[PDB]
């Protein structure tokens, strides 16, 4: 009857997207991978190391698909959490913005994410198609 | 918790005394009657009075009552 991303278990979809990205090789890794925090209020870099920036990218793409217009600050806000400030109560701290920006740039390069009027970023038609395909694949796997 | 004050009960009694014909049984009608006749300032107070009157009426249809 028809498939879209909105109809898929989310985590699984994300995983699939990541896998696809890996297969491609195409994205542009800036080379901050295996050095950086992801969120500036964290005790550790990723517990996968080799990759998961792909995963992040996929997640971002999914988010974009879900919404209309998405920016960098917003992304940071979404992805950041509660920093342990010592013997002091926790606070919401925005994620590493540069990484997000890089991801966005990569997406743009690929042809998935597109700069929009008003401000921020939306989805490209090719990108949408790709997403749909991924969703379909996921569904098939589930079946 | 719910025990009615002088300003409810006395008023209700007075109403009953004045208007036993045409102040009958069910609540809504009684309330309406109260609204018509008595110069009650608040709504809630009026409602309370009406309720009390209804109660009194109910009590009446089982024998006479003091005061």
């Amino acid at each position: 009857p028809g498939v879209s991303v909105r109809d898929v278990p989310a985590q699984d979809f994300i995983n699939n997207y990541a896998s696809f990205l890996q297969r491609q090789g195409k994205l542009e890794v800036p080379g901050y991978v295996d050095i950086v925090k992801t969120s500036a209020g964290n005790e550790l870099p990723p517990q996968d190391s080799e990759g998961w920036f792909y995963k992040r990218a996929a997640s971002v793409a999914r988010h974009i698909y879900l919404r209309k217009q998405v920016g960098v600050g917003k992304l940071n806000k979404l992805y950041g959490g509660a920093k342990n400030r010592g013997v002091r109560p926790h606070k919401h701290v925005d994620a590493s913005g540069s990484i997000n920006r890089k991801v966005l740039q990569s997406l743009e390069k690929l042809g998935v994410v597109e700069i929009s009027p008003k401000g921020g970023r939306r989805i490209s038609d090719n990108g949408l198609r790709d997403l749909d395909r991924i969703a379909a694949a996921t569904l098939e796997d589930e079946e | 918790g719910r025990v009615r004050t002088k300003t409810v009960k006395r008023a209700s009694k007075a109403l009953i005394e004045k208007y036993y014909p045409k102040l009958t049984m069910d609540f809504q009608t009684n309330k309406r009657l109260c609204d018509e006749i008595a110069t009650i300032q608040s709504k809630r107070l009026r409602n309370k009075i009406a309720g009390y009157t209804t109660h009194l009426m109910k009590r009446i249809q089982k024998g006479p009552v003091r005061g």
Partner: protein
């Protein structure tokens, strides 16, 4: 022109507006199908308006729910409430009364919150305390 009604569900702060339409049998929450929602352990709450009265009523009714406010659990509850309302509303409007009554009975017997929206609401905090009733630690030395 299609037979359709607009029923809501409310819990705490959360509101879920469900549009019940004539057609094929769609149950969608924020655009995503009923099969998801995903606090996951509370997935069966959202199923309770479906399975308590049966999928037989759902063959012609299409439900599109938009959920805003509250938390997650609350949102789920609201959605459930909306779903419960919607079918009943439809029955009242475009089907028949007996059926509606039956549905109500089915709902009412298992859980109260499905039709009657929950009474409870946050008590305001007042001074000299952390919460609404709980005061600070008084000390006499």
């Amino acid at each position: 022109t299609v037979p359709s009604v607009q029923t809501f569900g409310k819990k705490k702060s959360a509101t879920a507006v469900a549009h019940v339409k004539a057609g094929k049998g769609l149950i969608k929450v924020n655009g995503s199908p009923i099969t998801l929602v995903q606090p996951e352990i509370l997935r069966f709450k959202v199923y309770e308006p479906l399975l308590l009265v049966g999928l037989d009523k759902f063959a012609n009714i299409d439900i599109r729910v938009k959920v805003t406010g509250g938390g997650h659990v609350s949102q789920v509850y609201a959605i459930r409430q909306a779903i419960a309302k919607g079918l009943v509303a439809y029955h009242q409007k475009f089907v028949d009364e007996q059926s509606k009554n039956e549905l109500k009975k089915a709902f009412t017997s298992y859980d109260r919150t499905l039709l009657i929206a929950d009474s409870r609401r946050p008590e305001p905090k007042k001074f000299g305390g952390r919460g609404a009733r709980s005061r600070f630690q008084k000390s006499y030395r």
